[PDB]
Design an enzyme around this catalytic site. Structure first.
Site, mmCIF file in Angstrom:
data_model
loop_
_atom_site.group_PDB
_atom_site.id
_atom_site.type_symbol
_atom_site.label_atom_id
_atom_site.label_comp_id
_atom_site.label_asym_id
_atom_site.label_seq_id
_atom_site.Cartn_x
_atom_site.Cartn_y
_atom_site.Cartn_z
ATOM 1 N N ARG B 73 -28.204 18.310 110.040
ATOM 2 C CA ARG B 73 -28.689 18.667 111.549
ATOM 3 C C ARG B 73 -27.648 18.516 112.458
ATOM 4 N NH1 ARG B 73 -31.308 15.341 114.824
ATOM 5 N NH2 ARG B 73 -31.724 17.408 116.069
ATOM 6 N N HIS B 117 -29.835 19.921 122.808
ATOM 7 C CA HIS B 117 -29.777 18.488 122.616
ATOM 8 C C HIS B 117 -29.031 18.117 124.263
ATOM 9 C CE1 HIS B 117 -29.107 14.508 120.993
ATOM 10 N NE2 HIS B 117 -29.504 14.852 119.901
ATOM 11 N N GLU B 161 -35.860 15.346 121.268
ATOM 12 C CA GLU B 161 -36.255 14.067 122.156
ATOM 13 C C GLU B 161 -36.310 14.757 123.615
ATOM 14 O OE1 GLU B 161 -34.072 10.590 122.253
ATOM 15 O OE2 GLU B 161 -33.760 10.685 119.800
ATOM 16 N N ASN B 290 -38.132 10.662 115.537
ATOM 17 C CA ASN B 290 -37.020 9.647 115.744
ATOM 18 C C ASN B 290 -37.574 8.484 115.881
ATOM 19 O OD1 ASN B 290 -35.609 12.428 115.593
ATOM 20 N ND2 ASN B 290 -34.569 11.672 117.772
ATOM 21 N N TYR B 292 -36.171 4.027 116.118
ATOM 22 C CA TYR B 292 -35.158 3.053 115.953
ATOM 23 C C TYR B 292 -35.663 1.590 115.931
ATOM 24 C CZ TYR B 292 -31.675 6.739 116.717
ATOM 25 O OH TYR B 292 -30.747 7.859 116.843
ATOM 26 N N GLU B 363 -33.950 11.597 113.226
ATOM 27 C CA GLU B 363 -32.925 10.115 113.510
ATOM 28 C C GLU B 363 -33.390 8.929 113.111
ATOM 29 O OE1 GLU B 363 -30.920 10.523 117.219
ATOM 30 O OE2 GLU B 363 -31.646 12.750 117.527
#
Lengths: 458, 467
Positions: B73, B117, B161, B290, B292, B363
């Protein structure tokens, strides 16, 4: 704003920066074996190379010269001087430090060597270590050798933070040798202080000439609440941190409540013989002080009252817990930042204990630094940290405290013990793979503080 | 251990790694002007030089080939392709990414470029930015340009995002362009989704055969207490983080309770014209995910009840809710709480409540304080521990029935971590910024084996080789 004869400087250790763990007949210390034991140090880091100060010593002296400090504090390695503990002195080990001392005298920088910075030879550790009295005896024999052979020294330091060698090393198991025994640490407490006394006694016989003291990591501890349960818990941690060191050194006795608290464990303070306190309380010329941050203290199992008081929150033998203040800044170590604590500490020493010359032999903070695209290492929080704490020292001098020096920890990014090289205290950045020296923003800022003998207004 | 055709990869961003911001006719993005502003980024860091991937692109491609990943990516810079949006395509900009895509296919690595992005041109920001509608239209033209003039792409991504572009950029002011206006972020919310929809439809006409989707940073939010007050406070936080994106995409409508909540701010969701929801809900082939870590949520002004419950808390609030930290759980260098089991809940939730289309972890990764040692290595055991636990949760999701067909580690290189400058490091490859040197971390060699064996080795066993 600082006095006329204020001694500026920076501190290092032996094992942390030197490297060359085997060269010139050096034997493995307790940290050689502790770091090579798995699970003890982050990423299994050791001090084999470190900053490679043993070879690049002359580059580091020139950094001290360009920085313009009055004094450079460092440590002499026990395993270098006496590889054979009972045997004779290793001439190769004595030549390295004399060359370092001579180089410092050439640049008009006052050497302040420390005899012991936690690197005890393994051979003494195998036979009990600081738990037994024998080790304290053979330190004096080591101390005497370094007192007699190495010339050009006016000020000596016996021990650097006896609390950490004993209580992290034998009590909690974080530092070398890594035991988890309370009685072992309380024994080490006595024999380290005893070995300090023997060092001072060895000084006055061989070299009446020279001033000698020791370095302590004293703490400022505050009650979280004003209740009996929490205030008394603060008094216990205070005693362990300060008073079981300060009262023997400056009043020739251990604290009643701490002896009572440590009466349970063996060997502990059963190793205290008649006449030892007179050795321990041998009059020293100056006192070394190591401060980083205070600690808000409450009683053990008191987490709910802690959170109810607005705070945030290895077996608890002291029966006390540390609590965090939400707004207060932290360092990379997790230690809170409060410069006013350093003032409270220096003023307390002045009032309660001793009126001899005091030196801040170790003050700094870890921050996550990096080399950026331009090649600079920018650490504004370290500059702020050093500045804030130095204005506290200016206040202590205004209070009347006999403060005659300040030493930044550290000169170089070094082996930070249990965390290996993952924590950086130095004002000079290090590329460990090459051994390059990159002065940070701190080095440049401190150069202005040193030269002008005062703090520039940010 | 993993499926047969499981697609392993790793992700990067344009402004974060490329650099050469004023070379070959490239104009300032919103992060150019933002990072150069006083006190917006740590130590006044910018992305001027960064990883110097614009000059070292061939070196990084070789690392991607040696890593053995199926895909890679990356972001395609808007200001590099269209310096002046009114003007034509900057050929020098197109050739950089085409040569990168060609190099990817020659190394038999699947290219997965991302159109946006967070580097919106400054000229478009000066005319309102994502607040105004015309920005969304100008993206459709930009998307058209890249879809047409870039060959070799089978899978496209429109946005990375949107939430962070909108709410950190226009709502809270932490990210570029740095505005602090709720109506602005609610407007940017819609126009980002609208720009994705137009981008999807533009793909169907220009490149019929390509698959296309978008990347969302969805969250897993737990109520601090079991009381109505905090549960509903988490439901509001969930609406902002997840549901004002997922429902427009897969249900073709905004959540009613969130519309009522955001109605007081202008322009906001009043910018919704007729037929937008059908554009936004344009059928997509996959969904980039994504994640985290989760965050525990309680109502506003409820710090005392949090500490009373057993949480830690720090010292406007339009969502009327606060974040609280579970004391026991581990944190990364960012401060984000680690909890791999939350990723399994997010994936299963997306399966049940929304879509069954192929999913990709675009991600996932962590930040830690890496360092080059004397041996020249960069050992990062906590990052291996992180990735492993999250991959273990992925295997659970795959077992559960979730259509997960890929996984991308953030990131390839230790890059410009936006607000935190270069001070935070996410990559599997260490970067010396002053020279440009690159050193594969222990995670790189761990991931190299994982991709090669298409399965997880013993975690505790592999940490032993790193001492």
């Amino acid at each position: 704003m600082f006095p006329d004869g204020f001694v500026w400087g920076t501190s290092t250790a032996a094992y942390q920066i030197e490297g060359a763990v085997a060269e010139d007949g050096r034997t493995p210390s307790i940290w050689d074996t502790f770091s090579r034991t798995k699970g003890k140090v982050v990423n299994g880091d050791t001090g084999d190379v470190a900053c490679d100060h043993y070879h690049r010593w002359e580059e580091d002296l020139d950094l001290l010269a360009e920085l313009g400090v009055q004094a450079y504090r460092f440590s002499v390695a026990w395993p270098r001087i006496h590889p054979d503990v009972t045997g004779p002195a290793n001439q190769k080990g004595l030549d390295f430090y004399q060359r370092l001392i001579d180089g410092l005298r050439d640049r008009n920088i006052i050497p302040l060597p420390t005899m012991y910075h936690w690197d005890l030879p393994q051979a003494l550790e195998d036979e009990g270590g600081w738990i037994v009295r024998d080790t304290a005896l053979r330190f004096a024999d080591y101390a005497a050798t370094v007192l007699e052979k190495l010339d050009g020294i006016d000020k000596w330091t016996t021990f650097n933070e006896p609390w950490t060698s004993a209580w992290l090393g034998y009590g909690y198991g974080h530092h070398a040798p890594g035991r988890t025994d309370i009685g072992a640490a309380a024994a080490a407490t006595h024999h380290l202080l005893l070995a300090h006394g023997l060092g001072v006694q060895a000084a006055r016989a061989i070299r009446p000439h020279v001033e000698i003291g020791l370095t302590l990591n004293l703490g400022v501890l505050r009650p979280g609440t004003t209740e009996d349960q929490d205030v008394e818990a603060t008094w216990r941690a205070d005693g362990n941190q300060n008073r079981i060191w300060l009262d023997p050194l400056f009043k020739g006795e251990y604290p009643a409540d701490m002896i009572e608290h440590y009466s349970r464990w063996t060997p502990g303070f059963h190793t205290v013989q008649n006449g030892d306190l007179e050795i321990i309380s041998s009059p020293i010329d100056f006192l070394g002080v190591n401060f980083y941050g205070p600690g808000t203290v409450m009683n053990v199992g008191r987490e709910d009252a802690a959170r109810a008081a607005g705070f945030n929150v290895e077996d608890n033998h002291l029966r006390c817990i540390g609590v965090e203040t939400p707004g207060r800044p932290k360092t990379a170590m997790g230690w809170e930042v409060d410069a006013t604590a350093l003032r409270e500490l220096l003023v307390r020493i002045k009032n309660e204990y001793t009126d001899i010359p005091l030196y801040i032999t170790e003050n700094g903070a870890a921050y996550h630094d990096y080399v950026n695209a331009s090649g600079d290492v920018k650490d504004p929080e370290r500059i702020t940290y050093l500045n804030d704490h130095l204005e506290a020292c200016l206040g202590a001098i205004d209070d009347g405290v006999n403060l005659q020096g300040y030493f930044i920890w550290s000169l170089l990014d070094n082996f930070e013990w249990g965390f290996g090289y993952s924590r950086r205290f130095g004002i000079v950045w290090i590329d460990y793979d090459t051994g390059r020296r990159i002065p940070k923003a701190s080095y440049r800022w401190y150069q202005g503080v040193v030269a002008t003998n005062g703090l520039p207004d940010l």
